Write a protein that binds this ligand. Structure first.
Ligand SMILES: [Mg+2]
Ligand SMILES: [Mg+2]
Ligand SMILES: [Mg+2]
Lengths: 320, 326, 320, 326, 320, 326
């Protein structure tokens, strides 16, 4: 310590590329990327999403075609988000555990064609209920929890049966991680991993996602200590990996979570973060180098893995 | 869970308010402003929707409302005429330069408003770099400090309460402090840009200030920090505190919230953060497109307080102050 | 570090109001205030309390009138303290769980008229026993605990049935938080919060409160490490929020509790603290700015919420 | 367990990659090279299988591939002719010495390649010690610093971007920094060998550089650190940082990984480690015998990153860079 | 602090042997050494191992002869590794719990002849299965765990019955430490210690060991935080001592484990570490003083005990 | 428990040895010796059973066995003749004083044995205080430092490898270091008595050295530390390290083990402890009475290692070294 100018000039290591490379503390690699994908029900179709320029909803045959290039680029995993047809939404959310639902069909197709690619499914009831609430309601509109926990467990088990290696309770509820963990073990799916959405905030950054998928419990953005209690509870319940969401607006949370628990920590660069960046890049306001700058921030902040709609572009860039 | 259900405190608005850990107030806001030469001039900046370059007379008119909203301070950025740019950056310490003239006008009209001047040579050089170049094109450190010290003394003479060296030369905070003390400017605060990274988020600002064409495709990797580095920011801030800074800053902002958190935790000193032009533009573009709700503005600024910042330099300051006044 | 005069002059940030505001580390807001209220049994009555100048016991119709202004000022919650008529005090403390007791009637009235206002009820047997001890005694005068735990559970459930959002075991006993937590869950009151009086000291500052309400277990004032063990036990038993009491005389405890547990921490500025301040203000010895100075100390010390008889005055001042 | 089975993340390659905590890249590699006098000379070193001593012309040819593989820097070690060794170590600062000549040649041919010169008198003394001896045979500290400072200035004059004092004299980092600053060598980095132990793992290097016969059975216990001590390394590194080092190093490497970890955790500064000659030789001997698979090379280098090093001086650098390029 | 040259010259304590001895922070003693031994099935035989120069496989009568000198040198314990004849390897691994298996016979012989010498047996199924996997497989080749846990428990109990004072689940599995701990207690072997191979990496340094014994679950070398979670789980399951393996390539892990848990920590200087050092010593590339240098590194790094094939040589040297 | 029974590792000798956290070795021992003037003199000390005052010739004879046992160093304490005591303590720096003569004799006879001389004026003053008194009877700080510096230079001139200021004057470590550096005594170590308390355990030493009658009922509360204070010891040690001490010491020993532990944990520097005369006497009296077994000697010395000391000044050093040699 006691470093003082001019004995210490911090620009000396910045003088040349070689010394900036030798002291460089972090680096993003393709091992850090997870690509979220919106999956349609039909055959031979793609749809553009107005608020997520460059992102497409894909039927499963199209998903398989694009996955050939994602696998060649080395992306380790995908996170699937089905786009449920409105006629499949119900009150009992039976579509969540249908072995022929989009998520289950997509995961069987991908596990068969690309055996080493990781598939992370979404465990939640909101994409399948007519009302759009994440749970089954009683006559007055209040959540019945064990009826809902029951369908979620059937959902997670159906994902495990389709071959998913990871399930992600994307909900922000209590009791689900343990029930799913317990049910998977109970049913013999001992190596299915549970990626919990641990510190998930009530945020305006999810806007574009509601367009993509066709749609009191999320955390207050002001709170930071509360996120550590959320992650601790998920860890205690058996989560294998924990996630912070949204991402860049919560980088201080990523840093605190990694420092406190030293566990596998993930971060979601959500639809609104992607949309802001891409709109600015397309308008000529920001250079495309901001994509890698934003992703290296997650590594510097302490994330092991990043769910990002820029995964393909970033993997292509990681070459330079 | 079941004993500990964290949803209980979240159930109702009253209990969420009681347990809310951080709050954004107008005391935390600093508004950066782009100032033009001449009279009765107002110019839109396409890459910063909603922001205008203003001549001093127009700045004084707009500042009446910034003061009424209670914004504590402005950060001035002069839009130097192309013909006043040179290799020696001498316009940086001209007593009749835009920054100096704007400072005297604002200090007279609004005595309680804080004026934070920019100490840096980028608005004044033909090449757009923040210091003086040697014959190999390197930004010289100590020769640049000599010009920055002359610049900071000129701002103190104009009445600025705070000078903010945004240059990233090593040792400049101590040089400027020594010069201010020697000259009797005992209470001029120095707001150091301590951990300032070599980023792509500054694009729109280069357009706003008129340095974009001068810099061209140039980079500042020999002085601004590598985005990959976090421990190094602690060493930058420690030096600036030992050299006499009254406030230390992290820049850019949202992409570096982890740095704000480490800096506040390690040094427990007045910590500031800049929500830069590219952060403003990306949000504004998405809000205008209808992709993000307007509530994202306060959410973005709340993140800086949660991460540990005391004050935030933000182009959203007027809008945020209007929304907080509710 | 290595900050030294005259390079570092700490008065520079204090030179002007604008720079004092920019570096100001804490601020009190109306979101931090909880107002305790003494509730009478009758109709159209108020009583002055000699040792708490300016504070009044209020019948429920008067309470509703005053609550209109507390709600307009933004105060988030009230803590109710019934003033039990002597003819309702018994040996079995049945009045504690009477659905027509003052606390239950007051909470139903307030929950119906002001649905967003939080109500924190007092769970304790002392206001309802003839002897004034917080528990039911056996023939020799010794506490029978499960008979007492039983009535306290009926009490907390009766509060939950009346609509209380928060119950506060204001006792300083062991076993109660868990029994109440367990009983509320068991009965379906899953979102009722439990605000534990965790570090509550044996103190002379409660004097005036005994006048207001008509009335071996509290902590020794010398002890600080002991308070952390008290808070840890309440947290383990399911408390949603933890409180230190009294307040200003124990600000070091507030700081240690927030630092150690990072949980929602509350502090009671008790009747004697209020009385000392108000007597000095009324005598012209202290300016009224001391009220906000005393309340900002709780925020600086680490409290999230403050139970204070000055809540109305403070909310009115928070404007300047 | 059963809830927490740590084997779940280990089950598949994709999940092992997602949770992998550290990675080795070519940015982390520094290749040490032994340089001969003369022209068209290449010599094998029996105790360092696969490593050759090279004349400058041969070094320039081999460096074309080191540069193509992206290795950031070389660390030069001159093989001084026996007749140029003396009590005064004057060849250490000869402008026409091997290190000086090699540096000028490499700086001209490969402008972006980092050149790290060795500041130490062991290649130049008749006795093989790293400093000047007094009449009792003790290695004098301050008289040795005077020669090391002349040596470091000569390397800066030859164009080295980094000088690395590997001598273990007290206070030499500050003396060398002061001399570099006074002479205007503002940006010459100083890579201090901070916690360098008195070890048996240096045997093969003494053969490679030609100091083995000069040192004989001599020891360096009055200056290199006792292998038993760990807290003492923190005091060595603290002094070198206060004296102005830009990088600090632990040496040897694998036998001292605990020291690398404590040094990175305590100071959060650029931390380097040397996988010394004896570590290289023991691995190479076992790999050639078929006792260890070739995958041990990357496993050994991954350990340095896991332990906290930013950069690694390793004789395996070319092989490792070839394997990483996949 | 604030130590600065020339007031502080760190060479002053290094000037003389006496002051280097007074400030010397660590020292290796014979109390720190554990010698691993490869045991053959027959009588009056020894075999040289090509990739471990100087190490020999020993029949039990030869083992007893060599143990006389190990005991005279003060070595506290041996770790036995039987060399199973191929005709004893099966699918059910019954040889693991045979009371007449090499390990059991060797431990009864040593416990009877040298009552104070500690014996650490290896609990694992890999030396006894035809396939060489550490577990019993079902028809498709997948591990059946309770059949395997069952034989391992019989194995550990058979070791305890033969007189072993320590058993070492050398596996890298979950559930075994607890089952063995539970079974030993259940059976009355309350003082048998369990030395867990806690942080055991997937490494190339085990090469020579496969030659010596005739032969998804081991840790990734890149991970360090993961090792702390591994050690914590073993401690929670009842391990008496925890070990890091391999050794010198993982000294940073030894340091973190000792610092985090402050528990009895052991480290294995594996076959490849021994082979590299001995090959270099025999080639004249390294002096034999490197053996003690390598072993003092383990003490400096925080190990209490070291499993090392150099134990005999080191104990002989510890005299100088 | 039952899973975790801490008795399991304790069950057998082999497992207790494997988990044993600390060990005492002869490397940790320093033997204090009381030296007389004259020839062929040996005197028993009733309050320190087993300890003798020895003339230099007798000291050289006894030191042959201390050296054979491997004890690293001696700490010399001269038994000044009554007639050589004065107000100015000039005998402290007499080149022909007992300490100076004993040092030259031992350095010649046993070149590898460490000699630690005592820097303090208590053996030389008529009043027994460790410094010079003013007219109010106060022990002057800076005037005392001037005499201690002359004393320490005389010990360095006599050949002592270590001087140990046991005086408790503020700032003396830095004064002595500056004087040693200025005079070229570069490698003379300074073993500071850093946290030395005003204790009743020193009684027997005052008898051994002959200062007891001079001090009478006097006290040293204006300079030695109050036994109640622990945080203050950290401030004493920090100053002595910043002033250049090579080793820092806590004294007395067993009654202050908590201070040894805090000092090693806080500073991670070479830490020494003195098992003072009264600790020796109380143990010896109990052992001779048959109240405590002789095994208490090693138990007492093991406590210092467990508490964090690297070295121990103990009158039991010969006995302990004999017992460790087993
Ligand atoms: Mg700086
Ligand atoms: Mg050094
Ligand atoms: Mg002192």
């Amino acid at each position: 310590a006691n470093r003082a100018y001019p004995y210490t000039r911090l620009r000396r290591n910045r003088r040349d590329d070689f010394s900036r490379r030798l002291v460089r503390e972090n680096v993003l690699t393709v091992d850090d990327l997870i690509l979220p994908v919106f999956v349609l029900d039909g055959v031979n179709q793609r749809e553009s999403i107005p608020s997520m320029p460059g992102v497409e909803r894909l039927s499963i045959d199209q998903l398989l075609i694009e996955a050939e290039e994602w696998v060649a680029l080395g992306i380790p995993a995908l996170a699937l988000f089905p786009v449920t047809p409105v006629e499949k939404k119900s009150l009992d959310a039976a579509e969540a555990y249908n072995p022929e639902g989009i998520a289950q069909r997509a995961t069987r197709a991908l596990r068969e064609r690309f055996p080493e690619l990781g598939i992370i499914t979404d465990v939640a009831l909101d994409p399948f209920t007519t009302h759009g609430q994440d749970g089954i309601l009683d006559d007055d509109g209040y959540v019945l929890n064990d009826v809902s926990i029951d369908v979620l467990v059937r959902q997670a088990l159906s994902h495990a049966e389709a071959g998913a290696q990871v399930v992600a309770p994307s909900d922000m509820m209590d009791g689900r991680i343990g029930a799913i963990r317990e049910a998977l073990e109970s049913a013999g799916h001992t190596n299915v991993r549970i990626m919990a959405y641990s510190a998930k905030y009530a945020s305006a950054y999810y806007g574009p996602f509601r367009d993509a998928v066709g749609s009191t419990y999320q955390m207050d953005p002001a709170n930071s200590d509360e996120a550590l209690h959320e992650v601790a509870a998920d860890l205690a319940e058996g989560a294998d990996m924990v996630m912070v969401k949204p991402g860049m607006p919560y980088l201080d949370i990523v840093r605190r979570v990694k420092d406190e628990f030293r566990a596998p920590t993930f971060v979601y660069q959500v639809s609104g973060e992607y949309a802001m960046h891409m709109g600015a890049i397309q308008n000529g306001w920001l250079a495309e180098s901001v994509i890698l700058e934003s992703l290296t921030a997650f590594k510097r902040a302490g994330a092991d893995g990043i769910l990002t709609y820029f995964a393909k572009q970033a993997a292509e860039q990681l070459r330079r």
